[PDB]
Design a protein around this ligand. Structure first.
Ligand code: CLA
Ligand code: CLA
Ligand code: CLA
Ligand code: CLA
Ligand code: CLA
Ligand code: CLA
Ligand code: CLA
Ligand SMILES: CCCCCCCCCCCCCCCC(=O)OC[C@H](COP(=O)(O)OC[C@@H](O)CO)OC(=O)CCCCCCCCCCCCCCC
Ligand SMILES: CC1=C(C#C/C(C)=C/C=C/C(C)=C/C=C/C=C(C)/C=C/C=C(C)/C=C/C2=C(C)CCCC2(C)C)C(C)(C)C[C@H](O)C1
Ligand SMILES: CC1=C(C#C/C(C)=C/C=C/C(C)=C/C=C/C=C(C)/C=C/C=C(C)/C=C/C2=C(C)CCCC2(C)C)C(C)(C)C[C@H](O)C1
Ligand SMILES: CC1=C(C/C=C(\C)CCC[C@H](C)CCC[C@H](C)CCCC(C)C)C(=O)c2ccccc2C1=O
Ligand code: SF4
Lengths: 741, 74, 42, 168, 179, 78
């Protein structure tokens, strides 16, 4: 029976434990004999599985932590809306979106930092923003700072509601483990209620607010002259002017005469010629169809009324001759381990973020986002980074599950056991494929560099020489170009003009034009494959060898996160799943850096640009990608050296902050190498000398100073490495794109 | 500018000397491994006991100074 | 005020954050009212 | 146990009728999760502000100080915001509220009664019977004034007419 | 409250028989053994009877109001709203804002109705469904209490169908209830 | 744009038949029954519960909408 059961007043709200750091942990509650205690407090703050053996306690803590996170996110959103309402040039941008640069942040004039308040436009000077909030609001139909103030108020109220809910559901009414372990009910409610009703409500909002307001805005009406959303809601005649099918009502809906709504529910495709974004009348239909799909999908599982599926039955029924027992035990694993669920959900969320980055650039969804090149680049790279981090976290928590919550008794001759029983084949084959891809993807660049340096330019892998044409990608592009009318008969235009078609231009500037793939694109795609495969190798190898290996037969006893197992067996450094995550994070950084560089150069060289009166488009770099992106020297000179000019010549401008952050990110990246190339013994001995100096003056801390643990040194090195690298790319990208757009 | 780069050079020389002198003087023994002369000059480590003993050799001090010497000559 | 809450406010990170925020405000206001002081005036 | 005020609603558990003006009205259960003493202090602060605001509206309509420009009570807000008198009133209310914070902490500690600031300059509440009657009267008038001040301000915003002018 | 009219003996559909749900113990009023679809086996009888009495009251009041609006129109309305009958009158009063104020105050009442309903599950209230304590004049105070309960439910059931008929007759003919 | 015909006897017949077909099929295909009474019917329809009726009618409405729209598309219904 799916039912609600809670414990009343399980934990008393009191500050007694606020003054007892480490209370959650038995080893830490004693006190800080050394400085390692301080670091352990933070490393084990949110490891609820190591505080108690009670799954109920862990689940309640997780529920309340989620409520706190939602309150933080709502506060973030309310802050963004309030800054848009008070410290922005949103009205001027609405008046002339193609001339004034969006800005919603202003700095104080203290030490000359007021230079960062650049001339964005609209009589306003602030910090140009690249998050796309202006376009989000324009699509939502917001035309005033009053509406943004009300948005901020709603965000603040929801943040308060979420924090109250977290406190209430930890200290007043904490649900029980039987409540938590309702996968069928939770999936039904999420799918139908959360997703389906969310997209249904958004479709209603688009049909009643966004569509007419944006129709008038594209018609050129002034934001002040556009009527209000409640006017549209209550005046069916006013709406029936813009969309003449509202005079028909909901009778077509309930009689299945849905064609009557083709005026505002259509499958046009392409991009709005005025704004350069997707048709909001297409987005409304998209969200309505998604609502139907999700509400139907949320009726699949059994809750209380017999109708539905049991995922245990499905999984146990899915087995074959190559898999023995198949998916047996997985339902229990997933309703008894939060780490397995976290790994699955993180992998899916990161992959979704990557998919979102690709689609949101090729099919600009918001009005006036496509010609806002800083926004496009920033969003693409941002979501790429989020996806990479989520994937690495998925690997980490898969390893944590394998070490902590994996029980061989419950997993016998199922898929998990069989994977562990042939892990050597998997890793050896992935090793071979990684080496093959590395060779035949990077040695090609090396071959080209050597041939261009030797003057044998006819021996290179180039479009003007030996060719490596991505015929399959070009074939798919041709399919998608010709689909309108043939394989998608009732669509007027292609899904994206990147596959092919006519240039979409807004404000004498390209919004989206065909993206042509050649030898350089073939090369960079195979390098992307290489990097993804190597990252997968590192992460999967760590996960599979988390518990045991030929080297360390008892590794689950050492744990998921241990430094080593000593200098024996030749040396057993970094042999833990945690260290696999550490190296795989390095490699994820490599992969995403190459991906975002590919995006930046390709889009600045073959998509983005200004279109002349001759209908010809001149790009930001002008075709340098086809003949330069085939050599590492080409990348070093025509991309890094060439495009770093904007950020290195930003002093004295409003991008001087980008220049300074460029240098500081370089500093942090280099500073990471001190932790990464070094070990703990040297720093402990240096601390011994420094402590002698302190003792010579008859004083020294009661908390004995210690060098960072081996794992913590690796973690600090990795964190500084990632911060420095990503910050360098951040400053470089933003300075370049805000200078040339 | 010459003044500032000269003091950068002073920092580099002093830090390279710091690493090298510490390696030389702690080569025979420290409070972490008080019997280092028994293990010699270029042993890998002493294990994860006592907090971890990565790079606890005088060879490691050389290895770590070489990074700094390259920095300073750069 | 609760003595436990006061101990929490006496915890090291809270005190460090408050003290360094106070110092940052001190420096910021000194530079706001007496800016561009590259030298002691003599 | 149903509420005396609302027969069909169960009496809130925290509301036992001890406090003045307690008729068992708490449909949304704020008393269940929040301290009833803190809520009562908030109630009496709100009501005292509202009663003084009603009297201020009326007295400002009939009379205005010779040295202040004559204007409707609502407009005087925006006028004094720029003039600087509103800043002074706000600062002094804040000064008293700093000690109000200490009083609230003592109330949480149980050393004080909600709304009891020991303010009887004229000694009008010396005898119990009259004190309990006065406390019921104070809570009743506080709630009524909280309603009435909102009525006054909103009616002015609609009609752009002072209440005394409107009543005819 | 006769066991012959409303009681464990009554059966509306003989080929089926009286349902075995809690609602048909014979204690709940207005019981004519009528639940073909067996909705009272899946929803709380308290919730269902609360909804039934709310519908009874609203539809019954609406029917009396339609007859009154056809017979006698209050002075000052026949001019302000217009001369549109029934649902046209609803539109006219919406434009007047009369219906908006009605909705706001009815929602204020229904918030406390929501609290009363929730208290059945949250704090285990023993409030009878549809019982609000409104017996000012005092009729339930006697022996006629059960009879009055049955009369209430039966007249509300009559009124729901009657108002449906009245509204649809108006939608067709354009005439009010009195035609 | 496809054609969606206005309400007619044909649309009503398609919807009713889809609902009846899905009701009978739900008799054959729904494995677990909920715990409660059954709608007053005998024989094959002797355990037909209200939740099963509701589920079969929901699927019947999905199928009827799909069939109506598709037959209007191919032009047969319209
Ligand atoms: C959660 C996200 C978030 C973030 C990152 C920021 C960031 C900022 N806000 Mg804040 N702000 C937020 C939410 C956020 N706000 C919300 C939810 C509100 C609504 C109440 C506001 C209301 C607000 C105002 C009213 C102002 C700012 C200002 C600022 C800027 C200076 C703040 C400062 O120096 O305080 C330092 C304070 C200390 C005590 C230290 C800074 C860019 C200021 C600004 O932009 O001035 C030009 C400013 O005046 N914010
Ligand atoms: C949860 C979302 C939602 C909400 C709250 C409403 C609300 C409303 N719709 Mg509906 N509507 C929605 C989604 C929604 N709609 C969707 C997805 C569609 C597309 C099928 C429509 C299509 C639609 C039409 C064609 C009409 C309404 C109308 C109405 C009004 C009367 C009912 C009301 C304001 C009527 C109205 O007055 O519109 C202004 C009206 O004629 N709606
Ligand atoms: C849904 C997201 C999610 C959730 C709920 C968790 C939850 C958890 N993770 Mg994490 N994890 C995630 C995503 C997530 N992870 C991702 C994306 C990764 C990949 C990087 C990881 C990788 C990972 C590892 C490798 C490990 C965990 C561990 C844990 C557990 C303890 C973590 C802890 O105590 O943190 C407390 C919080 C901190 C220590 C703060 C860390 C923040 C660092 C210092 C960087 C912050 C920089 C910030 C952005 C500012 C930069 C700007 C600069 C100018 C200041 C906990 C169950 C640990 C575990 O289970 O061990 C047994 C563990 O070892 N996670
Ligand atoms: C519960 C349902 C209901 C609803 C929705 C309405 C709605 C309305 N009634 Mg009322 N009315 C009701 C019950 C209801 N009545 C009842 C129970 C009675 C009998 C006592 C009346 C008797 C009545 C009269 C005599 C008149 C109205 C009129 C009206 C309109 C203005 C409001 C008013 O006069 O008061 C409005 C459309 C006025 C009208 O029809 O104006 C043209 C009007 O004159 N009503
Ligand atoms: C339903 C809304 C409604 C509306 C819009 C009006 C509007 C009006 N009524 Mg009122 N009136 C209402 C309900 C309403 N009445 C009801 C429910 C009753 C019965 C108690 C009356 C009984 C009533 C009388 C007896 C008189 C008015 C009159 C008036 C006018 C002056 C305002 C007033 O006295 O009140 C005004 C046109 C006066 C009039 O006839 O003005 C035309 C008048 O003498 N009304
Ligand atoms: C007790 C309630 C009641 C009463 C006394 C009547 C009486 C009448 N209805 Mg019916 N009717 C009712 C409920 C009622 N109806 C309900 C609940 C509905 C909604 C489905 C209808 C819908 C309805 C329609 C659509 C029509 C009638 C019509 C009629 C007339 C002929 C009978 C018929 O159904 O045809 C008669 C005056 C006919 C007529 O001429 O009405 C003006 C007609 O066309 N009724
Ligand atoms: C006799 C009744 C009847 C008739 C005549 C039709 C006729 C039609 N239906 Mg159908 N339909 C019916 C019953 C009927 N339906 C019923 C009962 C249902 C309810 C379930 C539906 C539900 C339904 C839907 C939901 C849709 C249709 C559509 C259509 C029309 C276009 C379909 C098409 O050619 O797509 C051909 C399309 C393809 C070959 C491409 C399919 C690829 C998609 C986009 C992605 C799937 C990939 C997947 C994720 C991965 C592959 C599997 C993997 C394991 C390898 C077609 C005229 C479509 C429509 O109206 O379009 C305008 C439509 O969207 N019908
Ligand atoms: C997806 C591609 C699937 C490849 C065929 C694989 C295939 O579909 O097998 C599917 C096969 C079916 O297994 P059963 O029918 O036993 O299991 C059915 C399951 O539903 C129950 O567990 O399972 C295996 O034999 C797994 C072996 C993986 C084979 C390892 C080699 C492939 C490694 C991945 C590299 C692929 C590059 C391909 C280019
Ligand atoms: C904006 C602004 C300003 C301002 C301001 C101020 C001071 C605004 C103040 C607004 C106030 C006090 C609003 C009060 C609303 C009270 C309501 C709706 C009470 C409803 C009670 C009910 C329904 C009781 C019902 C009752 C209940 C429950 C139980 C008993 C029975 C029943 C009768 C049913 C200025 C003036 C400074 C101007 C400046 O430019 C900025
Ligand atoms: C205000 C307003 C509007 C409106 C409106 C309104 C107020 C609309 C109201 C509509 C109502 C009240 C409809 C009721 C229908 C009742 C039916 C069909 C009963 C069937 C009973 C049966 C089949 C019984 C069967 C059986 C049973 C159970 C028991 C006994 C045996 C038997 C009788 C055989 C609009 C829409 C015009 C719009 C306007 O802008 C604003
Ligand atoms: C430099 C270094 C040290 C010495 C560094 C130590 C002991 C760090 C102590 C730094 C202080 C206590 C932090 C506070 C001061 C910082 C300027 C503030 C930023 C830190 C907070 C945000 C946490 C190690 O102990 C070590 C151990 C293992 C591998 C590599 C290394 C390593 O590279
Ligand atoms: S101690 Fe340092 S070096 Fe020795 S094994 Fe562990 S990690 Fe490798």
């Amino acid at each position: 029976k799916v039912s609600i059961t809670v414990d009343k007043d399980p934990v008393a709200t009191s500050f007694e434990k606020w003054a007892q750091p480490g209370h959650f942990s038995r080893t830490l509650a004693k006190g800080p004999k050394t400085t390692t205690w301080i670091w352990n407090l933070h490393a084990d703050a949110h490891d609820f599985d190591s505080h108690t053996s009670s799954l109920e306690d862990i689940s309640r803590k997780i529920f309340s932590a989620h409520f706190g996170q939602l309150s933080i996110i709502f506060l973030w959103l309310s802050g963004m809306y309030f800054h848009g309402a008070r410290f922005s040039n949103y009205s001027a941008w609405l008046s002339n979106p193609t001339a004034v640069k969006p800005s919603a942040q202003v700095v104080w004039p203290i030490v000359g930092q007021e230079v960062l308040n650049g001339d964005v436009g609209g009589g306003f000077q602030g910090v140009q923003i690249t998050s796309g909030f202006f376009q989000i609001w324009r699509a939502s139909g917001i035309t005033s700072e009053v509406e943004l103030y009300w948005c901020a108020l709603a965000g603040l109220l929801m943040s308060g509601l979420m924090i109250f809910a977290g406190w209430f559901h930890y200290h007043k009414a904490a649900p029980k483990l039987e409540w938590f372990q309702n996968a069928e009910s939770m999936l039904n409610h999420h799918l139908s209620g959360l997703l389906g009703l969310g997209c249904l409500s958004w479709a209603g909002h688009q049909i009643h607010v966004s569509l007419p307001i944006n129709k008038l805005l594209d018609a050129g009406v002034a934001p002040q002259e556009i009527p209000l959303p409640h006017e549209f809601l209550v005046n069916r005649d006013l709406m029936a002017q813009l969309y003449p099918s509202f005079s028909k009502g909901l009778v077509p809906f309930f009689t299945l005469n849905w064609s009557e709504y083709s005026d505002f529910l259509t499958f046009k495709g392409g991009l709005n010629p005025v704004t350069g974004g997707l048709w909001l009348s297409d987005t409304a239909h998209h969200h309505l169809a998604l609502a139907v799909l999700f509400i139907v999908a949320g009726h699949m599982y059994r809750t209380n009324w017999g109708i539905g599926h049991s995922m245990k039955e499905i999984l146990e029924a899915h087995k074959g001759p190559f898999t023995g027992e198949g998916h047996k035990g997985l339902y229990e694993v997933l309703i008894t381990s939060w780490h397995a669920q976290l790994s699955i959900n993180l992998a899916m969320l990161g992959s979704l973020s990557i998919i979102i980055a690709h689609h949101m650039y090729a099919m600009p969804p918001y009005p006036y986002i496509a010609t806002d090149y800083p926004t496009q680049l920033s969003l693409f790279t941002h979501h790429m980074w989020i996806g990479g981090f989520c994937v690495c976290g998925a690997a980490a928590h898969a390893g944590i599950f394998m070490v902590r919550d994996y029980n061989p008794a419950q997993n016998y001759n199922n898929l998990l056991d069989r994977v562990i029983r042939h892990r050597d084949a998997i890793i050896s084959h992935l090793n071979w494929i990684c080496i093959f891809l590395g060779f035949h993807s990077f040695g090609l660049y090396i071959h080209n560099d050597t041939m261009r340096a030797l003057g044998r330019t006819q021996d290179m892998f180039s479009d003007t020489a030996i060719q490596l044409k991505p015929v399959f990608a070009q074939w798919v592009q041709n399919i998608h170009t010709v689909a309108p009318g043939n394989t998608t008969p009732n669509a007027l235009a292609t899904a994206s003009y990147a596959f092919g078609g006519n240039v979409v231009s807004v404000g004498n500037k390209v919004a989206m034009m065909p993206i042509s793939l050649g030898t350089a694109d073939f090369m960079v795609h195979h390098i992307h494959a290489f990097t993804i495969h190597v990252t997968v190798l590192i992460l999967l190898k760590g996960v599979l060898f988390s518990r045991n290996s030929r080297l360390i037969p008892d590794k689950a006893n050492l744990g998921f996160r241990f430094p080593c197992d000593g200098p024996g067996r030749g040396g057993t450094c970094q042999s833990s799943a945690w260290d696999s995550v550490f190296l795989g994070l390095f490699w994820m950084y490599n992969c995403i850096s190459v991906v975002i560089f590919h995006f930046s150069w390709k889009m600045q060289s073959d998509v983005w640009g200004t279109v002349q009166a001759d209908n010809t488009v001149t790009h930001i770099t002008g075709g340098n990608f086809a003949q330069s992106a085939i050599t590492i020297n080409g990348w070093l000179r025509d991309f890094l050296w060439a495009q770093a000019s904007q950020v290195i010549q930003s002093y004295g401008s409003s991008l001087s902050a980008y220049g300074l952050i460029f240098l500081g990110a370089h500093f942090i990246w280099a500073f990471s190498l001190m932790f990464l190339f070094s070990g703990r013994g040297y720093w402990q001995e240096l601390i011994e000398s420094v402590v002698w100096a302190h003792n010579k003056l008859n004083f020294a801390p009661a908390i004995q100073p210690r060098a960072l643990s081996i794992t913590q040194g690796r973690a600090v090195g990795l964190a500084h490495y990632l911060l420095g690298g990503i910050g360098t790319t951040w400053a470089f990208f933003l300075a370049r794109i805000i200078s040339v757009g | 500018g010459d003044f500032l780069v000269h003091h950068a050079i002073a920092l580099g020389l002093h830090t390279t000397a710091l690493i090298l002198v510490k390696g030389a003087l702690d080569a025979r023994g420290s409070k972490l491994m008080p019997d280092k002369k028994d293990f010699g000059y270029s042993f890998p480590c002493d294990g994860p006991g006592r907090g971890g003993t990565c790079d606890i050799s005088a060879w490691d001090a050389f290895y770590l100074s070489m990074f700094w010497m390259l920095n300073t000559i750069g | 005020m609760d003595s436990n809450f006061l101990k929490y406010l006496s915890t090291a990170p809270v005190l460090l954050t408050v003290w360094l925020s106070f110092t940052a405000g001190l420096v910021i206001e000194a530079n706001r009212f007496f800016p561009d002081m590259l030298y002691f005036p003599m | 146990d149903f509420s005396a005020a609302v027969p069909f609603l169960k009496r809130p558990s925290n509301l036992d009728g001890t406090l003045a003006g307690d008729v068992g009205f708490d449909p949304l259960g704020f008393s269940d999760v929040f301290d009833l003493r803190v809520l009562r202090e908030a109630e009496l602060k709100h009501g005292r502000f509202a009663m003084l605001a009603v009297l201020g509206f009326l007295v400002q309509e009939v009379y205005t100080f010779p040295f202040f420009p004559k204007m409707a009570p609502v407009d005087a807000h925006d006028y004094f915001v720029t003039q600087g008198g509103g800043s002074q009133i706000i600062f002094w209310i804040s000064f008293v509220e700093i000690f109000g914070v200490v009083a609230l902490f003592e109330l949480i500690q149980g050393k004080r009664d909600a709304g009891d600031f020991a303010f009887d300059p004229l000694g009008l509440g010396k005898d119990e019977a009259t004190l309990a009657r006065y406390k019921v009267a104070e809570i009743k008038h506080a709630r009524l004034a909280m309603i009435a001040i909102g009525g006054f301000i909103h009616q002015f915003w609609v009609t752009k007419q002072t209440v005394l002018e409107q009543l005819g | 409250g006769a066991g012959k009219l409303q009681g464990e003996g009554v059966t509306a559909i003989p080929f089926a028989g009286r349902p075995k749900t809690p609602a048909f113990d014979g204690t709940w009023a207005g019981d004519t053994g009528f639940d073909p679809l067996t909705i009272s086996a899946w929803l709380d009888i308290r919730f269902l009877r609360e909804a039934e009495l709310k519908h009874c009251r609203v539809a019954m009041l609406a029917a009396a109001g339609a007859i009154a609006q056809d017979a006698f129109t209050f002075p000052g309305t026949v001019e302000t709203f217009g001369t549109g009958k029934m649902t046209a009158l609803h539109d006219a009063a919406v434009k007047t804002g009369t219906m908006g104020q009605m909705l706001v105050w009815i929602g204020f009442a229904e918030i406390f109705s929501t609290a009363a309903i929730l208290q059945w599950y949250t704090d285990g209230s023993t409030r009878k469904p549809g019982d609000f304590g409104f017996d000012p004049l005092g009729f339930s105070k006697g022996k006629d209490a059960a009879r009055l309960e049955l009369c209430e439910l039966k007249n509300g059931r009559l009124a729901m169908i009657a108002i449906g008929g009245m509204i649809h007759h108006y939608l067709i003919t354009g005439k009010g209830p009195l035609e | 744009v496809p054609q969606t015909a206005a309400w007619s006897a044909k649309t009503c017949s398609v919807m009713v038949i889809s609902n009846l077909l899905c009701i009978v099929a739900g008799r054959y295909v729904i494995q677990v029954k909920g715990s409660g009474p059954s709608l007053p019917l005998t024989g094959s329809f002797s355990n037909f519960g209200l939740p099963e009726l509701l589920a079969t009618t929901s699927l019947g409405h999905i199928v009827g909408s799909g069939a109506i729209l598709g037959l209007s598309y191919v032009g047969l219904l319209s």
